């Protein structure tokens, strides 16, 4: 489907570049003389609910599937009914002898694996 | 595509030349009837310096 991402940027914190102690995780400026809370012109844009995504194309990858997280061969079997719908992303700690199993089971069942080139060797 | 086939395009199909000939030989008994027309079709069109395409009549 044609997806439309509203506001593809990141919503960094105000002054998150100026100082190293503040991070780029977003925090609402609860100041009284703030020029970000007051929504001045030329300052950054805050999260509002208007920037939400379409309810048909929310949580969809650019490929067009919802990403799942598998951890074993049993966690693949919740996806063989929904192959167009769900992709499969092997978790970040599945060992290399266990990746070539479920990368090979998903080649049989036909699930579109998201990160197959991880820990390949 | 990695063949470079040239699927019968360098030379010509036989019957295609006659239909272009019949149309040409039927039209030139009208083009040469008026003066300076065969010289007018043989020269391309371009814009000069004062060519304003909203004012001049085509």
């Amino acid at each position: 489907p044609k997806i439309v991402k509203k506001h593809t940027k990141k919503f960094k914190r105000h002054h998150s570049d100026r100082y190293h102690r503040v991070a780029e995780n977003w925090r609402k400026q609860k100041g009284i003389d703030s020029v970000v809370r007051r929504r001045f012109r030329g300052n950054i844009s805050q999260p509002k609910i208007g920037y939400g995504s379409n309810k048909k194309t929310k949580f969809l990858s650019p490929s067009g599937h919802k990403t799942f997280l598998v951890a074993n061969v049993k966690d693949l079997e919740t996806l063989t009914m929904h192959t167009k719908t769900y992709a499969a992303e092997i978790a970040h700690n599945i060992s290399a002898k266990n990746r070539v199993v479920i990368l090979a089971r998903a080649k049989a069942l036909g699930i579109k694996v998201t990160n197959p080139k991880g820990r390949l060797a | 595509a990695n063949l470079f086939p040239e699927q019968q395009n360098k030379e010509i199909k036989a019957e295609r030349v006659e239909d272009q000939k019949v149309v040409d030989k039927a039209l030139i008994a009208e083009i040469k009837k008026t003066p300076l027309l065969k010289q007018y079709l043989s020269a391309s069109f371009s814009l000069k310096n004062g060519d304003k395409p909203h004012m001049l009549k085509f």
């Binding site: - | 814009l47 000069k48 304003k52 909203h54």
Partner: protein, 106 residues
């Protein structure tokens, strides 16, 4: 012959703007020889091209083209607006674009 041109070389004036604010989606194109809004109604829909030269070669060409069309007339002097596909880069304020005659109604 050295007669080759089928466009009219307009300039790229600015973005559509107010005082102190500008909107980079709409650019103002000053076509040559156009002095009124009526007879700027001839060029509506005819498409422009901003041809420029780059250094790295793509598709075997060193010249890259940005297309786009003429949308509506601007005020009282034959300025027109234009909506390019990718907007013009604002280094081209006072840079020749070429209004073609491609969707023609003559």
């Amino acid at each position: 012959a050295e007669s080759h041109r089928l466009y009219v070389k307009g300039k790229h004036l600015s973005y559509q703007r107010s005082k102190r604010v500008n909107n980079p989606n709409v650019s103002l194109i000053k076509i040559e020889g156009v002095a009124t809004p009526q007879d700027a109604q001839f060029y509506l829909g005819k498409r422009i091209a901003y041809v420029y030269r780059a250094s790295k070669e793509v598709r075997g060409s060193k010249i890259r083209v940005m297309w786009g069309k003429v949308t509506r007339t601007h005020g009282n002097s034959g300025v027109v607006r234009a909506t390019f596909r990718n907007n013009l880069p604002a280094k081209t304020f006072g840079a020749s674009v070429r209004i073609f005659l491609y969707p023609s109604n003559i």
